[PDB]
Design an enzyme around this catalytic site. Structure first.
Site, short mmCIF file in Angstrom:
data_model
loop_
_atom_site.label_atom_id
_atom_site.label_comp_id
_atom_site.label_asym_id
_atom_site.label_seq_id
_atom_site.Cartn_x
_atom_site.Cartn_y
_atom_site.Cartn_z
CB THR A 1 11.98 18.28 39.96
OG1 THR A 1 11.28 17.24 40.63
CG2 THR A 1 10.99 19.35 39.59
NE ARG A 29 5.13 13.00 46.32
CZ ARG A 29 6.09 13.82 45.90
NH1 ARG A 29 6.68 13.62 44.73
NH2 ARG A 29 6.48 14.83 46.65
CB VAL A 30 0.45 13.47 42.24
CG1 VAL A 30 0.58 14.66 41.31
CG2 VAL A 30 -0.13 12.27 41.49
N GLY A 31 3.40 14.89 43.36
CA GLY A 31 4.00 16.08 43.97
C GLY A 31 3.47 17.32 43.31
CG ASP A 32 5.97 20.82 43.41
OD1 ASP A 32 6.56 19.80 43.76
OD2 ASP A 32 6.50 21.74 42.80
N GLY A 53 11.40 20.96 44.92
CA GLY A 53 11.67 20.70 46.35
C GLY A 53 10.63 19.75 46.92
CB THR A 54 9.67 19.15 50.50
OG1 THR A 54 9.49 20.52 50.87
CG2 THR A 54 11.06 18.74 50.93
#
Ligand code: CL
Ligand code: NA
Ligand code: NA
EC number: 3.4.19.5
Lengths: 134, 155, 161, 134
Positions: A1, A29-32, A53-54
């Protein structure tokens, strides 16, 4: 990232975030990172933010926009807002990581609660600082 | 007055596993990209072009998990995501799940400026990009031995 | 405070002028049955999470509303369905975007929340995750309705005008 | 687009949003509906929100979460927050639509700036209200 935030000579704020996500990720999957207000937010009235991050936790706490909302509606400083979000609210949800933020006054913060965050910043016409560890 | 910050990710970093020669590579890359960004801001470039270029460079740099040097999914594929936002207009562009675009941040910027939309995903995002003249890349161009080894380790 | 449910089937240019009481009554009866289901569940001590899941499952099932069956059509005469669910207790959330082969996106969204470490899944990736968890695959044409297709044909005509 | 919000007998808030998107949509386009804090949000300490309207403006304004932040950080009532978001800010930004919201005190709001919003609400063990027009 990866991410960038900037305040220009005309007083404009911008933010960008890009990622390949996580090693061994479940396809789909899609993160922030691509979600406005989670991993990326910019508003000339407040702050520019890019997160890392998470990703699940940055989404659930809407980290980027929460900085903006605390400053805008709460009257918190950039530093107060960053401490609240990164050091208190994200860990409370099991979140780890950090972000970069520049407010409309050109204040800069690079909070993280992890061992490391690859980061760098600098004022225009001035000498840059890099950072890995605390 | 004018100022830039960048990041190349948090949490992926442990002193006990890093060599000093790796730390130096990262310091050099971070320092070179923030400087590019500083020069742009001093020259009167916009915050939007500056964050766009900074993230483009971090994508191109194989050291960073974005564009070239992306991590691998469980299926040994690359799925890339990116967002950009202009604080002057609250305009924003974003792509998620793209495999055939070299610079997600530039695709996100194309959604912002050359569509009425904020977010495009998957093949639809890619077809939109191609139709606006963005080049189609083979997905293997992001693949690195370092990231591939991290995938085998994770299993 | 008191247990309570609100539902919507969308905001927009709903023209009293065009509508007859008879058309309106189809919407009112659908809304009334669904909210009454949620009230009954709330009265029996069911969770807010299961109440909103079920209310939205029924709005999906009802062809009058643009969600699941009766989804509007894309430019490509396809259906791309999106949904989200969030638990104010845990602040866990589940979401799918751009799925064509899942009957009830809100149930897939809930499945992402409950049976993955994730918040959001898209496209074929979302569909393969739900199939692997034992949710059924449907033909994309199950959502197709004459009324929405005629609306696509009208939007196309307007575009050429 | 469709949605539900609920407050249960145990004080839990929840929100769900589902859509087929828009007639003639560009394939791959994503509106507020599936985006946490844009078309859907729920927090026991504040509100449950489900939105419907011009998706790009509800994303850019983080409509659902904004209701939460206006109440929590701004100290606005649910009614003030809904007026601010739906009747002032979203229209200024060039967006149209509405939302449904229940706060942690069981107040309910169904604001919209369009001609219609298909809607219904009701307290457990009371008579429901339905509606189409203003
Ligand atoms: Cl009415
Ligand atoms: Na890279
Ligand atoms: Na339906």
């Amino acid at each position: 990232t990866v991410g960038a935030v900037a305040l220009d000579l005309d007083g404009n704020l911008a933010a960008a975030t890009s990622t390949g996500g996580i090693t061994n990720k479940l396809p789909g999957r899609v993160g922030d990172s691509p979600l406005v207000g989670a991993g990326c937010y910019a508003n000339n009235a407040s702050v520019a933010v890019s997160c890392t991050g998470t990703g699940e936790v940055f989404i659930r706490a809407l980290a980027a926009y929460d900085i903006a909302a605390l400053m805008d509606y709460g009257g918190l400083s950039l530093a107060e807002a960053c401490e609240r979000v990164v050091m208190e609210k994200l860990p409370a949800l099991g979140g780890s990581g950090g972000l970069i933020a520049i407010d409309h006054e050109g204040n800069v913060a690079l909070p993280f609660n992890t061992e490391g965050m690859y980061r760098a910043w600098g004022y225009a016409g001035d000498t840059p600082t890099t950072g890995i560890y605390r | 007055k004018a100022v830039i910050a960048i990041h190349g990710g948090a949490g992926a970093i442990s002193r006990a596993q890093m060599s000093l020669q790796q730390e130096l590579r990262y310091i050099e890359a971070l320092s070179a990209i923030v400087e590019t960004g500083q020069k742009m801001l001093e020259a009167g470039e916009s915050a939007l072009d500056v964050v766009t270029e900074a993230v483009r460079l971090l994508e191109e740099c194989p050291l960073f998990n974005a564009g070239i040097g992306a991590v691998f999914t469980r299926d040994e594929t690359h799925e890339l995501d990116a967002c950009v936002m202009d604080g002057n207009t609250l305009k924003a562009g974003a792509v998620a799940g793209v495999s055939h675009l070299r610079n997600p941040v530039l695709a996100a910027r194309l959604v912002m400026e050359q569509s009425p939309h904020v977010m495009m995903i998957g093949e639809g995002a890619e077809n939109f990009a191609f139709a606006r003249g963005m080049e189609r890349v083979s997905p293997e161009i992001f693949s690195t031995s370092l990231r591939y080894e991290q995938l085998l380790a994770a299993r």
